[model samples]
Target chain A: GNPLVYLDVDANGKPLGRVVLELKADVVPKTAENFRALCTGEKGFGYKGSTFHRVIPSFMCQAGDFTNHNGTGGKSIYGSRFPDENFTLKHVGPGVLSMANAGPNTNGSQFFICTIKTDWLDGKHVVFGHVIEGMDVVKKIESFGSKSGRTSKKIVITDCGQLS
Target chain B: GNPLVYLDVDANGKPLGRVVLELKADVVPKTAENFRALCTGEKGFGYKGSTFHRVIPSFMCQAGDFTNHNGTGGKSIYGSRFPDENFTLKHVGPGVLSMANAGPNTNGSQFFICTIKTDWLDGKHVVFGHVIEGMDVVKKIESFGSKSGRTSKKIVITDCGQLS
Candidate 1:
């Protein structure tokens, strides 16, 4: 259901730059629809103001836990089970962005960017987006480990529109 | 002081072969010293049957904590700490093995293996070993995946001896 789109942002809250998340429409339509619904609303109201809650330096950074302060917690949240899609597009290397879900089939909004190569999750998570630029920024923000004093560099998703 | 040794282990149950950690000897001396000591008479009694207590998929797999089965508490019998001898000789790519610790200066027995390239931890953890082979086995380690099953592919240092 979710169609691919372009993301653009601005300092004045207007479109400044654009990035595309090419959705494989044929891969998993249900997941695609969900992706589209989340972005359809203005300001990406479903996802804005959310912060990456759990982060590990040099490893992985995760956010979009709707149940948590940085997440949506809208429905069927927290322990809400989803069946594993187990897609074939393997998460082969770094700079690759993919959806973050609870387990097989349990994906919602949470997602992550590969600061480095990772095939351990080859058939588990869905690969949807990839970092085109600002990978260094991704790496930099992720450098903050989980602790009280830890902080993340601000990354604003200025816009989200379709690519295909 | 603890002498850490780099290690490689074959999948095992009955006298599995030793798989060695491939890395430059110049890096992570303290962690290496203790790791090495585990192989020899030095603190020999301290490291037998060490359990990998914690594993977080796409992040790290931890072991060497003697405190409790949960992997907390107690310093090594050697109970040693060393100057943070950070090294940059090699990138801590996927499967990079390093000693884990309680604090920056407190290292004893605790260690972790990266399932991904973890350059994000460049200056923090002391990396002593690099995964040379069987990364596929590491990827299949059930303990550190979505299930958090604590399922390892059985990495036992069946025989500890020096390289020829």
Candidate 2:
């Protein structure tokens, strides 16, 4: 299926990739609602153009800091924390989409994607979206300059918008 | 540092991400050695451009598939799997990298990177590399697409050459 967006370094160019969504449809409900708020425009798609600032090689990729250029510099627009969803989604599988947390219920706008099967996070973070295109691009983009054990991969979301 | 190969699908050419290696530097000394062999041309980068065929999103990313593309695909160029370097490395955190193992002393052409910290896998998998850059790109790849948790993400090694 065509993703919500096509990635390109330029505006209105060929799609290098289909935009994958890390939604909470099967795991937590309220947390999913919160994520929906942002995607549906109620909360705001402000994340459309934000960058995925934090990436842990082979471990996870994180984003959603609306306050910071990299999702690390600001407060969550949700403004508050919620109860633990405690869903059953496993965390150790490629293309698994999950959420990031600062504290208990402090999850407002942080999300992560799994380049590999992530089984360690089961029942902790909720499963939301999965990647739909360019899996090769996924690994290639994350394996650059990695220290093999020192954690050193990063990717920036140049921009975001509805797919056309 | 620039990667050996940078594959840009469209004009938006995404940058490669980084990963970490949690080599049981203490246990899997040879595991690390096998890893170094694949990364550098010294013993021979046997797994150069090998795909991380098995990935578990939100949990871990596995690569070094030098055999059959399936987990069954054993290590090729390396000829023989080395003895268990068995260190005390465990899956305990985000961005943890470890060697994939099936049986005792059967470490072969397969490795994984973690997204979250996993303390459960201590003394189990041989630790190797870590993510350092381009993790966001890893998060954006397509899932294998399964409701029962069969999210398949792709790993593309665009370039592999003598490590500087």
Candidate 3:
């Protein structure tokens, strides 16, 4: 079984916090595989040094779009898009991990973690994972970052890898 | 006829930006009146010096909760809760001003300005006003503020008065 991934953030070039994501491979197989492979740096693609470019305080924090460091870019490790593996995993609480897409069937490297229950997003995006630890750090980023919720200072993903 | 109101933000005790709101007195007379009286400083209850305590990027920026800086506290100028004045005015785009509530019929001093279209909030919140000008300033506040989307510096409502 592929393990969870730990995303560590660097502030001012120093370690700041960590967010652990437990991928739901059982339900969203393709989406989970895509995310896990990206974390493992498989196929010359990974989340290292990626920026949490879009942070919306009470809604979610968006990142994983490493190509342009903006919300508009990034693709799956397959070098192509994948159809949404959306299931019945309702976005009932905070810490939901989901894929960011232009629309349906546009899964890519960009993802977001809900800082609060976004029931409104239910059935629209693919829920591939959930935060199991360091949600406070996510809240911290939500409170201290810029208005677009983009961190005024760069929030670098120091490293990302599967957990034991 | 009721007039529009201009809310100016102060950064480092200096004017930073302004957001102008046009109250919807026709559809939501009570809700609009409550907001207008608060802005006028009637009975010493107003939006002066209040902070935009909660901001969710691309969603909305919340404020008018003068009693407490955080989102939890504040009351309508009437000093009591009011029923929903829900109307046909959909939250179609940015700058739609709406009331924050605990649930149905819980209109209070807390209000929000859509930084982007928030159609999801249409029936759940009270739509009482719209931004007539300075939406760019709202977007600026949305982009530059802290994690809670609260401005990094004290974003005081320097002044709030009805526009002729």
Candidate 4:
């Protein structure tokens, strides 16, 4: 069985709901572990107050920049950034979880959950997980996103942890 | 009088139009000069490659992050950051220009153009300039924004400079 994680989300100071993510550790071990550890916050840092800073309708909603709270900041369990575990996964459809990066091998803590079939991101971003539950919650967050990836309302991760 | 600047705009790879900004140096001289020089890019940094990362309809469109492109990264021509010159200006109506900051005295290269009356931002963000010739272009940019402050379309400053 895969590891499950949860993120309690809110927008504009109101709670939207909780989103559950299932890490494909069997396929992308290191990437999944990084996300899982970050979610649990067993380390010194996590995404509790982080924001869904970059988002787009029919595209995806992004988050996990714990330090800066915006897309520009975040560190992996390994460090500031880590290498992409692999591009073994494809962004075939919605709810696809993938890493956001500056370029090749620049994977950080930032990740985006696709709401539309983002096939274009197939090889460019490392796909390592998917939403197991709360797709509606991700959709609600997507609704808050403009084409600019900034939300008209503030969307933040209120709490998160491994769901057992 | 004041410096007139123009930003040739594009969205999702299509030209939306041009936006003309008039800086009110009369009230905030240093603040306006920093913006004007950045527009001209005489010192080699400007908003030419920047994106309107934050947009809220009936609210505003924000840009001027040359370094990181997202809202988190930007630097004033003077340096990394500077103080708010004054709150002498008011956000009374649409097309009003103002500075965006994290908090008190943290003005940087980022600025926003309002599309609606934002009286709530009056004492917080510094009122600096206004759109003198391209309210329609600004509105079009606003159209791309979602509730998250991100745009539904990619709005970039294709070209920019101070106009004679």
Provide the overall lDDT of each model, using Cα atoms, as 2-decimal numbers.
0.53, 0.52, 0.77, 0.85
Candidate 2 residue lDDT tens string, B77-128: 3464655565565666666567776434567767666666665556556665
Worst 10 residues of 2 chain A by lDDT: A6-15
lDDT digits (tens) for residues B32-79 of candidate 4: 998899888899888887888878787889888788776767889888
- Clash tally, candidates in order: 37, 112, 11, 23
True contacts kept of each: 0.00, 0.00, 0.00, 0.05
**How much is B153 displaced in model 3, in angstroms?**
40
Instruction: State the lDDT of candidate 3 residue by residue for B1-164, as single tens digits.
Output: 65688898875686767778888788888888888888888767789888777666868888877875765567876666778976667888988998877546767788888877877666767898898889887886676554335445556788887775
Better of 1 and 4 by DockQ: 4
Query: What docking class should model 2 receive?
Result: incorrect
Q: What is the DockQ of candidate 1?
A: 0.03
Q: Give the candidate order by descending TM-score.
A: 4, 3, 1, 2
Candidate 1 global CA lDDT score: 0.53
Tell me the lDDT of model 2 at B113.
Answer: 66
TM-score-wise, the better of 2 and 3 is 3
* lDDT tens readout by residue for model 2, A1-164: 22243222112232334454545455565665565555444454545555555555666555666664443343344564455566666675777767765323446667767777777566556676666665565554455423222113334445554342
Interface RMSD of 1: 9.8
Model 4, position A59: C-alpha lDDT score: 87
lDDT order, best first, reads: 4, 3, 1, 2
Interface RMSD per candidate: 9.8, 16.2, 16.2, 8.2
Leading candidate by TM-score: 4
> For candidate 1 chain A, which ten residues in a row score worst on lDDT?
A70-79
- Write the residue-wise lDDT of candidate 4 on A9-128 in tens digits: 999889999999999999999999999988988997887888898787988998988876656678998887788788899988988899987556778899999998877567768999
Per-residue lDDT of A1-164 in model 1, one digit per residue for the tens? Answer: 43555434232243234444555556755555555555554423444444455555644655554444343232222234445454756666666667775345656667666665667666767876555555555555566544321334433454454444
Pairwise lDDT winner, candidates 1 and 4: 4
